[PDB]
Each structure stands twice: as C-alpha cells, then as structure tokens.
Subunit: 445 residues, 4 copies
C-alpha cells in the first residue's frame, strides 16, 4: 500500500543531512498547508497528451534549466527561456505538421543530484552543494549546511515563475501572431536566423489565409498549453506538495505536472521509485548506460502496472558513443513485452566530459550525434522517437562547444561548468529544432 | 411605382419578335408557377459580400460562359468550368490573403445581345440568333423564329446546372483538401503549372499545420459559397422568375443571385434599367466607352438611390487602348458624388476584333493589358479595383490568341468566333489569377 | 459481375409495358447524358451518418411524399414539407440531445407500386396508374399508356425541387434562429403548439447563451445537411442516373442519396435487388409481415456482403397488430449473425385499411401504436430503434383518422385515399416527434 | 510628467509610519526585482472587456475578500470563493444572455483603509491595524509596528493565489460541464438551491444540444477569463510592481489587472490619484455620498483624459437611503459632459452600521435595496447599470443580517465585524445573482 510518506521506509540516495529534524518537520508542515502549483485535472490532461505522443501522433518537447537558482529569479530570464521553447515548438509544429507537447524544466527544478556527497578544497571538506532548495553554492560551512527554510523559498520562486508562465501561455504572449517576437535578438546575421524568419513569414501567410477563409477566430491560435516538470529528488518537498484530487480521491504530486526520477536514484527498491509509484501524474525515468533490459521491465511493472500509454516517459541519455550499442536491446524488450512508453532523448547528460579539475564540457556536435542516432535506432526497430529533453537558456551565452561559434566564458556561466552542466543556447536549440522537424517530416512522409 | 411587369411600358432594345403572343403568355404563366433558382436570403448574403468588396476587404471573381447552350448540357462541362473558378479563387485567397466572392456566369446565361437584329447569307435574311433561350443557331427559318417553349428548356437546364453546382460547393468537391484536383490535366509541363502545384503544396502545409494546432474542424475549410449571375436580357424570363420574399414582401429576381444590364441595353429610360430598379438583388451594369460621367451618375441614382454599398457593380469594359483615357473621369465623378460602388474589370468585351467576314478574335495580351491598366487607374485615383469579370472555359481549347501557345481551331469553338466570343482557357485564367494575386498583395502590402 | 444494366436479365415485378421500345431507349439515352441529382461524395457522407445511427449515436428521420405529382410542383409545397421535417428534427435534437439525420422522400419519389396491374371501372379495364413518371392518373387510354417522355419531366421536377431544398438547407432557411418560422400557422391554439413554442424559446435561450459565451459563430448553427431518397422502382430511370465516381471508379445511383426497395419488389433473385447490389449508396429495404428471418439474412448477404454499418437500412412496416409478433425473430437473427443494420419504423404502410370500394384509411392511433411497439421490441431485444420513415405533408389537411381533430375530405386529398395513401399532417408529425424525443431521451438516460 | 515614484511628492492619506526608512527601501528594491503578477497585455484585454460593459454589451462582476490574511492562506478558501464567483457569473450569463466580465478581489487585497490611525483599549493606544501587508491584527506593540518584510509575504501569497486561480480558470475547473460542482454543499434544501440546480440542468441540456449539433468542440466552453483587482492603497507595493510593457514602453501596475482608489484616498491632488493617473490598467474609483458632480468630472479629467471607454469604473457606494438622492446628479453630469464610464454598484460599503462598541453590522436587505435602486436610477436616467462590486466568501458562515437565516457568530467571523466588514455568503451571493439576472433580462428585453 502507498501513502505520500511511504518513501521514508525505503533505502534512499542523494538526500541531504539536515541538522535539526524538528525544524525540518515544521517547515514541511508549513509547506503542506500552502496551495499546490498544479491542479490534478491538468496532470490528467498532460497524460492524455503523453498518450498522443506514445501513439505516434505528437512529439514531446521538454526543456529548461539545469538547476534554477535564487540569485536568478527574474521575469526576463523566465520569458527568454519560454521564447526559445516556443520557437522550437512552432518550428516542429509547422515544418513537420506535428502537434508538440510543451513541458518546461521550470518552476521547481532546484534540487541537483551529485556524484559525491562532499567537496574538498585545499584541506577543507564540506557537504556537497545540492541546489538552492537544500543549501548554498558558496564553499563555506554556513552555506553548505542544509537549511529547511530553503524549501519555502523554492516554493515561493516556483509559484511566481509558474504564475508568469501561465500568464504568458494563456494571456497573449504565445499567440501565433507573435511568432517573430519569440526570436531572441542575438539570433541574427546567420543562415539559421534567416531560416526561422522565413518560417515565421510562412506562419504569417497561413494566418492571413485562415483569416481570408473566415477563421482566425479560433482560440487555439491565441494560446497554448504549457506544463512544468522537474526531477523528483528532494522527497520532503514532493511529499508536502502531494495532494488528493477533490473529485476522485487519488493522489497527485502537485509540485509540477510531470515528475521524473534521475539516473542515480532509480533503484527499484528505493525511495524515489516508491514515491512516484503512487501518484497520478505522468512521470519519467532517466535511462543511462547502466540500465539493462531485464531491470527496465521490472521498473515499468512498478511504475506503470496498468500499461497506460500516457503514464511513462523513458528519457534515454546514453552518450553519442553508446546509444547505438545500448538502446536497441531496451526497445526490443519493450516491444516483446507489449509495453506502452513514450521514448525521449536526453542528448546532454550522457555527453559531459569532466576534467581532473572538475571543469565540465559538452560538445554540441556530440549532442546532435546522439539525437541523430536516437532517431536512427527507433527507425531500425520500428518504434517511435517521441521526444527531446534538453537543458537550455535564453541568455546570450555559449556554454556548449562545437557550436557555430566559440564558447563564451562569462562568470555567470561558471556555475554551468562546475556545479551545473552546460546548457544549449538559442542558436543551438533552434538548430536542433530544425533537425528534429526534418526528421519528423521524413518519419511522417 | 414598380412591378415585375412595369418594364413592358418602357422602350426596349434587343428583344425577339415572337410569332404568337398568346403562346408566349402561356409559357410565361407556366414558368411563373415553377420554383425559383435562388432564395431571396441568398441574394441578400451576396449583397453583404459585395459590401465587403466595395469597402476594400474582399475581391469579386465573376466568370463563366459567353452563352450556355442546350447542345452542351453536361456535368463534365459544368464541373470543369467550376474547377477553373476554384483554382483562380484559391490562388487569389492564399497568395493575397484576400477573401474572394465567387460568382459564376452559369445556370442561366443563355440570352445574347446582338449588333444586328438580322443575319444575311447569300441573299437570304433571317432573324439574328439571340441565344438558345430565344431561338436556334442554325441559319434556317424554323431555327430562327423565336420559340417561347425555349424559356422552359432554359429553366430546366438552369435548375440542373445550379443543383449540381450547389452540390459541388457544399458537398465536398470544394473542400481545400481537393486543391490539386482543381487543376485540369492539360495544365502541365509549364512554369505556370509548377507555380500552381507549389501553391497547392503550401495550402496542404497550411491545413496540416492547422490540424496540428487543433483546428481542421472548421466547416469553412470544407465548403464554399458560390453564386450565379447572368445578363438580365430577356425580360419575359426574368419577370416569370421574379418573386416576393416570404418574410419581407420585397421583390427579388430569383432566376440568379446577381443580374446585370448589358452595354447595349442600359438606356436610362429603358426597360432593362426599369426591371432591375425594383428588385432586391445585387446588380451590375456594363460600362463601355460610350458612357460619360454625367449619365453614369444618373444611372446610379436610379439603380442605387439609397447608396447601399452592396447593391451595384460597375463592370468596366473599355478596351486596352481606352481604359486609361476613359475610366479616370468616371471614378472622379463617383468620388465627387460620394457613391458606393463595386468596380470590376471585364477585360474581354472591349477587346474583340471583328473582321469583315464576321470572324472574331481576342488577343490575350490585350486582355492582360486592360486588367493591368484598370488596377493602375484605380491606384492613381485612390479608389479600389474590386473585381474581375471574364468569359472562360474548362475545355482543352485555345480561343484567344496571344496566349503561351497558339489557338486551336476546333469546330466546337467556331461558335466562339462568330455568334459568341472567344473565352479564356484554364492556362490563361490561371495566369490572370496570379497577376491579380500579385497586384492585390501589393495593394494590401 | 454487375453493371448498371444487369438488372435487365432478372425477373422483375411492378414494371410498366411501354408501347414503343425504341422510343423508350431514346429517352433513356437523353437522360443518361443529363447531370446527376447528387454527387457520389454526398452519398458517402450519408453512409457515414447512417453508421452513426447504426451505432446508436444518432437517429434517422425520413419523411415526405407518398408520391410526388406533376400537378403539384410548387415552391410552397416543397418549403412547407421541409418545415415539418425541420420542426421534427429540432424537437428530437434538442429534447433528446441526439443528432438527427434528415432524409426527405422528395425530388424523385414518383413511381408507385400497385397491388394490381390494371384497374376496371364499369366494364372498362385500363393499365394501373403507376405514378406520374410512368403515366397519368386519369382513367382513360391516353393517360394510362406509359409515356417514356415522363421520365424527363420527372427528372426536371427533381432538379428544380432539390435545387430549392439545397438552397433552403444551406442558404439560411434552416438557420436555428428561424426555429419559430418552421411552425406552420395552423399549428396553433393547442397544447402541442404551445409545447413547440416553448421548445423554440429554449432554443432561442441556448443560442443567446452561446452568443454570450463567445460562440454563435459556428456555421453548424446556420445550416444543416439534407439528403433525398426514393423507392428505386422504375429501373430505367435509376440506370440512366447511375454514374461512376470520378475519383474511385465506383458506381452510384445519382438520382438520390438513398434508394430503397419496396416490400413488393424485394425478391432475392429479382431485378431491384440486382440493381442496388452494385451501387455505392446507402440503401434501404421495406420489411413487411411476409419476411422471415432466413430470407432476411440471405437478402443482407447480397445487399451488404462486407457488413458495412452505414450501408443498409431495414425499414420495418408490420402493422400495429403484428410488429410485436414478427419483429423480435428478425432482430434475433441479425444479432445471432452479427449484422450491422439501421432499423427504422415505417408505421404507415402496414396500417392501411382498404374498403371494398378501394377507399383507403389510416388511423393515426394505429400509427402511434406501431411506433411505440417498435421501440418496445428493440428495448426488449437489446438492439437500437434507429429511425422513423413517414409519409407527411405541410398542407392544411387531415388525411389520417384518429388525430386530435377529424379528417378533412378535400378533393386534393382524394388521391391520398385511392391511388396514394393517407399522409400525416403537421400536427400529427409534431406529436410523433415529441413521442420519439421522449422515448430517445429515456433510451439515453 | 509621471513616473512610478511621482506619487511620493503628493499629499497622502492612510499610509503607515515605518520605523526604518532604509529597511523599507531595501524591501522595496527586492520586490522591484521579483516577477509581476500580471502581463500588460492582460490588462489591455480587461480594458477591452470594460469597453464592452460600458457600451451595454456585457456586465462586470467583481467580488472577493474584504481583506485577505496570512492566517487564511489555503487552496480551499481560494477555490470556494472562486466557485461562488462562477456560480454568480453563469446565472447571469445564462438567464440574461449577457457576457460577464469576472474580476476577483483576490491575490492582493491586503491593505485596509481605516477611519482612525490609532486604536485604544483600556488606556493603551497603538497604531491601527492596516491589513497584513502592513502589520498584524494583534493589539500589541510588536504586531502593530509596520514591518516592511510583510510586503514580501503579501507578494508571495499573491503569486500562489493567482497561480492557482489561473490553473482553475484555464485548466478545467471552470469548464461548463462542471456547473453543478460550483454549488457549495450548504446551498441545499431551499427554493434558491433548487433554482440553481434547475438552471444548471438547463446548461447541461444546452451543452448536450450543442454536442448533437456538432459543436462542443469550442474552447470557450472549457475555460474562462479571470482577472484580479485590489485597492491601490499601499503605494510602496504598487510602485515596486509597476513595470514597463516590453513592446510599447508604457507603464502598467502589474500587481493586479485592475486597481481602484478608495473613498478615503481619492483626493484629486493626492498620491493615489497621482499613481493611477499614469498606468495603463483599467482602474476604478469608489464614489460615496461625499462626491459632488463638479469634483467627479474633475477626477475623470485626470484619470481618463482621452475618454477611453474601457479605462474607468465608477464604483458607487451610497447606502440604500442615499443612492436615489445622490446618484442621479452624478449620472446627469457624466451624460452632459459626454464621458464614457463603467458604472458599478458597491452595495456594501455604504450600508455598514458601526455601534459605539465598534461592532459592525450589514443588513442584507439594505444591500439588496441599494442594488435595486441603483438599477432604478440608471433606468430613469437612460444610462447603463454596468456592474456589481461585492465582498463575499465561500465559507459556511452568515455575516450579514437579514438573510434567509440568522447570522452565525463564529470566531473566524469576528474579524469581519471589527477590523474588516461583513461579507456575503454563497446563499446571499446567489440570491443577488438571480436578482441581477432578472433585472438584466428586463433591460435587454
Ligand atoms: N470557405 C472558404 C475557404 C475555401 C473553401 N474552398 C475554397 C475554394 C477556393 C477558395 C477558398 C475556399 C472561402 O470561401 O474562402
Ligand atoms: N495552440 C496551438 C497553436 C499554438 C499557439 N501558440 C503556439 C506556439 C508554438 C507552437 C504552437 C502554438 C498548439 O499548441 O499547437
Ligand atoms: N468562456 C465563456 C463560457 C464560460 C465558461 N465557464 C464559465 C463560467 C461562468 C460563466 C461563463 C463561463 C465565458 O466566459 O462566458
Ligand atoms: N447543423 C446542426 C444544427 C441544425 C441547424 N439547423 C437545424 C434544423 C433542425 C435540427 C438541427 C439543426 C444539425 O444538423 O444538427
Ligand atoms: Cl491542496
Ligand atoms: Cl560527434
Ligand atoms: Cl416562389
Ligand atoms: Cl497589348
Ligand atoms: Cl455524371
Ligand atoms: Cl391502436
Ligand atoms: Cl517585469
Ligand atoms: Cl431596506
Ligand atoms: Co544538467
Ligand atoms: Co461574350
Ligand atoms: Co404510401
Ligand atoms: Co470591506
């Protein structure tokens, strides 16, 4: 049997050590009384859309932050990342004639899993930084001791962020008439920028035609659905925000529409699998090179016992060198056992190089290579390449190498070569969108 | 005061001499008891659409037969002419983003005005052929004596023709998914054929996008309004088919949605002006080189005393040599007197050359030149070039010279160089549509 | 193998004896060259709607003339019968929340099957009157000899009638704002008239609500689909109007959307079954008391070999005394053999009493009793009561007894007590519609 | 000239005395960097809807808290108040056929104007409670000293509240299929409860009809616009949340869609008028008995110099005894000077009785009397009664006397008889909605 607190009886990885259990429990009770971020009916609607993807009738775009931070809590940052997501979505929707399910890694993507539980600099060892929802990035004792009050700050940043995202999605910002406005000003003077401009002009002509034909009325042209997701890592936060549906009695984790389990926390007997087992949300699991086909099926039996086609997103992150060797055997097992899953590529988390110094690099060419091979593997196996899962930014930076132009090495990006990972910029994201749109069009041809 | 028979008190041109007045009256009474071709509410809807054109928010496409004939009463002929009209309309709608009001010279365009009331061949003089609704094309006494029973045959051909047209317009034939099917098979292996194909592909992509966005539902994508028109020439026919609106009591000529007065029958004190004065239909007048600005205004005072913007279509047919010299003074008068009119170009009837032999030629280059100059004159005067009025066919023939390829001289086309006039073929009609679409796009830019 | 003329090799009932075979063949060739009444795509759309009925998601309303006549060829008669059909449809649609498929016995219901091939009055025996498409109602030699030219007159009346019906259905007459206007002025000063008025007011409030909510735009509120049907009896007419679909090559009888075989002409080895076997239209068969379950299945095997759910309408006409005894065994056979059929009640043709004099009476109470029992039988068997098939008129007459008020005995109705049968009037039709709407609401509850 | 800080140069009423100016300024800067609650485009959309009301084509429903509190920050409270607003809106929309603009006094209605700047209990005098955004309700020094950190707590409660409201409005909670679910369980066993049930059933029948007709698709049936409003009282909060529109450069107060000036702070030379003068939001002004016609016009000149019809809501709160004597002269002045305003009734704030003890009572019968007279006055003057502005709750309490049943005297309601004012409950709100719906229907008849 399941409860929102049943995870606490299981073995668990990646959790902080709080210094005062009672203080933690007080903050958890405060949070438990605060309004949810999402309505259960919305999570059901995302499941319905996931089922369209799983059936090959739509495509899942999931994108946003590596890890959101309290020091970057602005409307401009939120807006500009949303613009990139809209630009990618409209490229794929128009060029491929394919509905796109838009899910942001936003409004709650704070907690970060770490390779090591501690960090050492020149003879001093402190607890690892686990994201702003747990502790601070500064290498000092006060910063690194987990502080339960950070749960509430994360909640407050999430409600402000999602309120604004809902306002943009429904209130006119995402109206198709605004297609040119979604292109960030630093996408310019290039073949890619021209390509988007031309596509946007084709959309203008489409809308003018639909107006001349007597439509243009349709609310679908003026708004779009937008959903949120994050890794369900800090289960104290997730439990506090887990709530029963008023109508059905069924539990939903209402911190976000979609929750996923990370590659380091997907132990079948573990806490994270136990938490998501019993919520009604659509959910995801990160599937890295260590996953074999036997243990994948066992995980699916726990996380989707009814084999519902909108329930489960398998987010494959193998690396450009391993996707061809590892993915086919997993697909074959799913096909053999008749399982309904939404397959996505995370082409980023398997393609990070960490130097001895700790400095992280991601080569955009390896990113693109993994995406190309992911579609190739699905094509060979007769299965459906259903989505893309990326870390990106609307900021005018270059964090991944191998792009058209060289990396920028701004201090604001230092976080994204050490504690976090390198994100795609708008140019890279747009190039990826065009690649996917061409690939989808050929699949649907 | 007005009645459906008040025209009979006026001087009249272009009427046949029937041999038995009582026989004529019996056929008129039979017809008066037959159902109308159109519903008054439909004529009102066309007036509403004419008002959109007059205001510069739409464009009027009027096209079809020089004169319909009893010997060419087929579904294939009707369908193929309708295809050309759809192809022209969709080109202008998509390329210019402009609603197109589609009106066919069909389902009643039988009566023909003639330069001479008789015809002489080798010492024998007979009454002129005035169209199948009056008499027969054969040069012999029996054929040429007006036969009132031909009124009923024309009525029956009209109901069959319009029934089929309504079925095509509403029943799926004009669904935008059928855009490729409207291109006749002899439009091929040319730059123009490729141009339409490419536009049709853009429409497919538009519809696929609208489906991906969640529309594609809209009935407007599956059907289109279609209206009929003919010259109100044989007033016996028009009177019999003139009926009172059930709801409003007001009279409509229900032989067609739109009726026009020909260039030879527009005498301000004459029968034809008197007939149309008192019906509620949208109406047209042919305006040739003989029209001065004073008498135009006097005509408008009679035909549109309330200055209703959906009432009156001025159909300008000057010839490519005269449109620049004659049209500006007419527009200036309309602007000065604040009159609301829909200006159309008939670029055909002012560009016919009749040799001493009687053989008629129309140079497509002169046709295009008059259209170009018509738009030029409106541009210079600040008025709106609101429509095109053409004679065309879906048959695989070439009747007008100066086209990409030479004229065909098929016997079926002999009618159209003697009694009737040369029609545009599908290639010419499509070339014209692209010219207009480019011109409209530049007007709306 | 099948052709439009393959029926001519089979045994045939109910056909006229034409005096000149060559003359008949000339008229058939003339007709074969005239435009069709319907487009094959439309017949396909009606099949799609029949499939909705068969699945229990809609209801079939079929109504119109016993037999159309040349002497009653008016717009008013056509309009007023259409009003009754609209009133019945809107009652069932609004009160039961059930889509209604509207099919008129109109624009071609001329040929009549007869009990006897001749008629005798005071020592003189003449061929039976078989409807105006064959011969005349007058009891004299000239009238009764079949005249092939009547095929063309029937065609011409049909195109005029259907043109007008299409105009009403699509052009505004059937806009839901016109709901009060469909009530004929002689429905007044009664509980039934008040009941319709109140329902019409509820529709007004619905439309005002939808306008206030931001809809009211929808073309579905302004137009409705309308289809035609008649008994395929005079196969010469049907063959001439049978045409190949341009796109698919498949044959459709394009005289009407739906054709049915009469109770006297449904011999499994006969001409009428052979004709309809090979056309693509939705079709019907009249099923009277003489039908057993074995021969029904054999008929279905011929007429619907692929068991398509939109193909076949079984039109049950048993009489109020026999429907309970005869229908259950037929339903059981269809259920046992897994056949997909649309079951309708014709509650009129099994409830006619013919006196020794020849005078026909129909008791409206028996009509209602058969309808009630038809729904009862379906309820008991777990099958779907899918439609109603009636003979009705918009004329201010009373032809069936047992109505609220007594029969009128107008001369115009004498036809409908001798050669034709008594029709329901508007009051009776409305009462029936309310009965059906209540019954459907209880089925869907 | 105007800036977001120009109010600071003007004389000002109702402001707190903060103990540390620098601390206040630090919190203001923090807030100034946080995301806005609303998008400027949304405020423009509300102006567009206000213009519909002003023109007599819609009705404004504004309702919610007297003053929101930190101790009542729940999803249930937010949801249940939203249910009441939906129930009122759907009653007026369906029964009157009138679009309703829905605006909640929610997500920011914290600051309260007070009659006295201090409060004395048994020889101790402390600063007045001014709402949770300023200080605490407890009568003690620590509670009553203004604390600038409360600005941030109010912001955080507002983003959580509006996020949830947006989720309900767009995400399915406000789908018209949910009409029964908006009725709170304690509305039952009464004529009023039956009346709503019956109306909800009529809506179900409407939706079933629209489904049967082929609609039911429309996104307008599934979602609704919802906007927020509060009194712009604490100008420090408003200034921090005032932001420039990205596209137009123009300033909007992005704390809420609509802001109003209270009856005690509407001095024409004062700070509150100065603040709202220069923002682009739709705005309101409370108009009490002290307002004369000369000073109203002068206020309108400042707050709506362009006489835009969507800009200004005059919220009339006179008391049931004074509305008839005071309102007509104000309307006459507006009509004489050609001003475009949206007239609303606040029938609550002029109908409070404060005993010597301080205990506040509001008689629901006086509330209804003022509303009735407000509509009467507009009817007499030829102007439009455009909206209602109420304080209400979804809690199962009775705070206003004169209701069907007696007041409850729950401790949770003690706030609403001392510091705040008595709110309407769901029964009272529904009764009011029916009164208004009947009145609107008669206006539109
Ligand atoms: N009904 C729309 C679109 C449309 C349908 N079929 C068409 C054919 C040609 C042009 C446009 C259309 C219109 O008339 O504009
Ligand atoms: N609402 C549609 C169309 C749409 C609106 N805005 C968008 C932005 C991007 C992509 C599509 C859209 C959809 O989500 O598909
Ligand atoms: N969207 C429509 C209909 C609607 C949906 N939900 C509502 C709730 C109440 C009133 C109306 C509605 C409107 O706002 O009018
Ligand atoms: N077009 C819809 C609604 C409709 C329009 N006119 C009608 C007349 C009767 C019944 C329904 C309708 C339908 O056929 O259902
Ligand atoms: Cl909750
Ligand atoms: Cl690579
Ligand atoms: Cl008529
Ligand atoms: Cl030329
Ligand atoms: Cl054909
Ligand atoms: Cl009986
Ligand atoms: Cl901002
Ligand atoms: Cl009172
Ligand atoms: Co990362
Ligand atoms: Co001509
Ligand atoms: Co009969
Ligand atoms: Co108050």
């Amino acid at each position: 049997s399941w409860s929102p607190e049943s995870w606490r009886a299981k073995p668990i990885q990646q959790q902080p050590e709080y210094p005062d259990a009672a203080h933690l429990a007080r903050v958890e009770q405060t949070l438990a009384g605060y309004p949810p971020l999402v309505f259960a009916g919305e999570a059901r609607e995302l499941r319905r859309q996931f089922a369209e993807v799983t059936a090959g009738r739509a495509f899942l775009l999931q994108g946003g932050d590596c890890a959101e931070s309290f020091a970057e809590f602005s409307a401009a940052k939120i807006r500009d990342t949303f613009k990139v997501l809209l630009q990618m979505a409209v490229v794929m929707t128009f060029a491929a004639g394919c509905p796109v399910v838009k899910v942001g890694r936003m409004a709650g993507q704070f907690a970060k899993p770490r390779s090591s539980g501690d960090e050492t600099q020149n003879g001093v060892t402190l607890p690892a930084y686990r994201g702003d929802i747990v502790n601070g990035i500064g290498f000092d004792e006060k910063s690194r001791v987990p502080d339960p009050e950070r749960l509430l700050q994360a909640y407050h940043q999430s409600t402000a962020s999602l309120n604004l995202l809902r306002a943009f999605a429904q209130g006119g910002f995402a109206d198709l008439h605004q297609v040119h406005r979604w292109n960030l000003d630093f996408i310019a003077n290039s073949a890619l920028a021209e390509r988007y401009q031309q596509l946007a002009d084709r959309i203008d002509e489409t809308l003018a035609f639909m107006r001349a034909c007597g439509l243009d009325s349709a609310p679908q042209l003026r708004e779009t659905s937008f959903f949120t997701a994050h890794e369900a890592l800090l289960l104290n936060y997730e439990e506090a925000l887990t709530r029963r549906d008023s109508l059905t009695g069924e539990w939903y984790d209402c911190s976000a529409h979609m929750l996923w389990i990370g590659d380091r926390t997907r132990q079948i007997d573990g806490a994270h699998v136990e938490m998501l087992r019993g919520v009604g949300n659509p959910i995801g699991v990160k599937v890295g090179p260590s996953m074999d086909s036997e243990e994948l099926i066992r995980l699916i039996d726990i996380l989707n016992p009814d084999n519902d086609p909108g329930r489960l997103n398998l987010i494959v992150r193998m690396g450009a060198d391993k996707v061809g060797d590892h993915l086919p055997r997993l697909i074959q097992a799913i096909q053999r056992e008749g399982r309904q899953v939404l397959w996505s590529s995370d082409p980023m988390h398997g393609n990070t190089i960490k130097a001895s110094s700790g400095y992280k690099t991601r080569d955009f060419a390896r990113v693109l290579a993994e995406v190309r091979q992911f579609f190739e593997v699905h094509q060979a196996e007769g299965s459906y390449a259903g989505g893309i899962h990326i870390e990106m930014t609307g900021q005018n930076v270059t964090e991944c190498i191998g792009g058209s132009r060289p990396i920028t090495e701004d201090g604001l990006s230092d976080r994204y070569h050490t504690h976090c990972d390198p994100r795609l910029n708008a140019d890279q994201s747009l190039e990826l969108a065009f690649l996917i749109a061409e690939t989808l069009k050929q699949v649907r041809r």
